[PDB]
Ligand SMILES: CC(=O)N[C@@H]1[C@@H](O)[C@@H](O)[C@@H](CO)O[C@H]1O
Ligand SMILES: [Ca+2]
């Protein structure tokens with residue numbers, strides 16, 4: 860399994876900060892740039908839980924998902940997550956959940972191959988009460 864092409868995806872999120880340079884549009888989570896990040900909207904803060912959804916560009920049999928946090932800082936580093944999948948873009952179901960440390964390290968989810976047109980990362984808890992993500996990848 861290899862990473863699906865990010866340019867064939869579309870990212871949307873429940874909350875996103877406007878483009879203020881390197882943050883925080885949902886689409887910055889899939890631009891192949893470690894220095895740009897999705898960040899939940901702040902001023903005013905939109906409280907967790909918040910989610911980011913990747914429309915994959917097709918119906919794929921996916922087996923791995925990676926979460927690269929922002930670097931240089933910690934706000935929004937996700938520490939309690941769910942990963943959900945959908946086959947229709949509306950009906951979602953949980954396939955992964957757990958805890959990550961607030962460190963900058965790549966966080967990797969592996970799961971049984973399952974069919975998906977969309978993947979949704981739910982940030983339940985995150986540093987500062989924000990959620991952010993530098994790069995998200997999905998493997999099929
Ligand atoms: C470098 C850094 O930490 N930037 C953060 C920004 O990403 C956001 O989390 C904001 C929340 O108000 O705080 C800023 O200081
Ligand atoms: Ca990025």
Ligand code: NA
Nearest residue numbers: 939983984985
């Ligand atoms: Na709690």
